[PDB]
Design a protein around this ligand. Structure first.
Ligand SMILES: *CC(=O)N1CCN(C(=O)c2ccco2)CC1
Ligand SMILES: *CC(=O)N1CCN(C(=O)c2ccco2)CC1
Lengths: 304, 304
């Protein structure tokens, strides 16, 4: 029993973190096989980051200008290229700790673990969600860029995020491991405002299911609703529209608990309309939206 | 910027988890050097766990009855002993991945990372606090016993917790790595009720400091208080008494922010008396008490 905001074990990713230094800029890189992946802004002076021309800046850089250090051993860089907003540094040694891995581009509402690193050294691990406005709410100080987000399926690390920037509002923006930003963000120090941070409805429902399974039941009511009726209330409270796809995804949690998805919708509807009245659910005073239906099943079933 | 409930990187502890099987009971064990540490209740039939006599049960057990598996390789058990509520299984092979380590017995209010495991395989990592009633609020299913709690100081893992039991109220009890329970709990399936789960005052204040540092400032007021005046309000709200020791510990966060500890006490006092009025602090609708002053400094400074 008990339900916790739970990250994947980080060891497989710890084994992949290196330090990348270009001139006076030191960031993190991800070493998989004989490639090191890092944010292309490693090549910028903070002056450059006002309006950088990365192709032009990169002409001035050689293999030997990229200093790559794994623990306290230097890797030999034998090639470099830019793919979107990342650099791929070819090194002469395959990472002996390379796990089975994939690069995946997640959808908004999907959750992942971040291994926060500084100078290629892990400081901590936490669970995130790709927000509907394509930001993440992370914990990233200067030096943390190149820290990655991942999921693990048994022995395969799916890398979904690399950290690139903090918006003036203190929320975070980054790329997949092909170097394509999530959302409309650019690796430039300019006016970039996030859109509406809406609540991930399907995740709230999954977490209400988790609460029932773990004995927190006070919010279960006598009501049901329809997708359309629920969605009117969702819209009013800046919740994501609930789709039949979302209902299908919640099917197994529905089955296990014997609470129809639309009944749990009606419970969530009353919580939105009435508030918590100073009560808590799984130790929260607000409705948690950074557990996926998959996360709830995994943690409630004990997958390794 | 941003502040997250952050666990230590788990890799060093992942390398220490094994499976222990005695008859039909399979739990987790911690392999350090040539010793495997596990809960002594590995020897019990669930019938036994009503009123077990562990010394008597252990007479019936040989080295060869303890099946120890590290990945998919069996370890040879060459000795076994009971220390308090843990078994120490001597194996013929030193764990090659043994990190630098210590066994520490933490105080209530101290935080630690848990690596939740099943069958000696890591499923996830989360941050906990030793509650003032010597319980922890974890995420533990059947098979999770022998999962451990730890802190890391650069390269040294301090092991502070091994998971042994769930109370009927779905909160968790366990031992240090000398096998001594935290609090008054016993490894018996009997009536065991937790005392008052009071709020860790010094941790709330540390987290209010974290909030100020990360730009969440709406709750800062024009007031101050005294330790005695604050403590009257603390008592009323089932908060731990604040001591001069706690004030001294918050000194560096006071210094960094320029907010006197007693001013932040007065802010917390108004939050207790007035509530959040539907507002949030670092994305919470309640006052978080599972960050230590040390945790706030570490995460705000980016220690690795
Ligand atoms: C995410 C990260 O580590 N960084 C550090 C490098 N960089 C800057 O310091 C910078 C330059 C101009 C604006 O910010 C980006 C963030
Ligand atoms: C923590 C853990 O893994 N367990 C599993 C073994 N055990 C029981 O199933 C049990 C027997 C009697 C009561 O509970 C303790 C908890």
């Amino acid at each position: 029993s008990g339900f916790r905001k739970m990250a994947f074990p980080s060891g497989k990713v710890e084994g992949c973190m290196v330090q990348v230094t270009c001139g006076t800029t030191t960031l993190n890189g991800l070493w998989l096989d004989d490639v090191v992946y890092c944010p292309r802004h490693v090549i910028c002076t903070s002056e450059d980051m006002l309006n950088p021309n990365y192709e032009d800046l990169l002409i001035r850089k050689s293999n030997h200008n990229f200093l790559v250090q794994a623990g306290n051993v230097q890797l030999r860089v034998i090639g470099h290229s830019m793919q979107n907003c990342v650099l791929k540094l070819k090194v002469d040694t395959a990472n002996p700790k390379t796990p089975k891995y994939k690069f995946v581009r997640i959808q908004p509402g999907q959750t992942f673990s971040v291994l926060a690193c500084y100078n290629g050294s892990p400081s901590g691990v936490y669970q995130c969600a790709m927000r509907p406005n394509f930001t993440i709410k992370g914990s990233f100080l200067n030096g943390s860029c190149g820290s990655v987000g991942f999921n693990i399926d048994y022995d395969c690390v799916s890398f979904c995020y690399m950290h690139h920037m903090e918006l003036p509002t203190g929320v975070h923006a980054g790329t997949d491991l092909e170097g394509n930003f999530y959302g409309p963000f650019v690796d430039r120090q300019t006016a970039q405002a996030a859109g509406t941070d809406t609540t991930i409805t399907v995740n709230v429902l999954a977490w209400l299911y988790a609460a029932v399974i773990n004995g927190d039941r006070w919010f279960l009511n006598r009501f049901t609703t329809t997708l359309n009726d629920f969605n009117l209330v969702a819209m009013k409270y800046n919740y994501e529209p609930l789709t039949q796809d979302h209902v299908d995804i919640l099917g197994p949690l529905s089955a296990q608990t014997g609470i129809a998805v639309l009944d749990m919708c009606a419970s969530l509807k009353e919580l939105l309309q009435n508030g918590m009245n100073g009560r808590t659910i799984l130790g929260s005073a607000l409705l948690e939206d950074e557990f996926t239906p998959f996360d709830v099943v995994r943690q409630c079933s004990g997958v390794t």
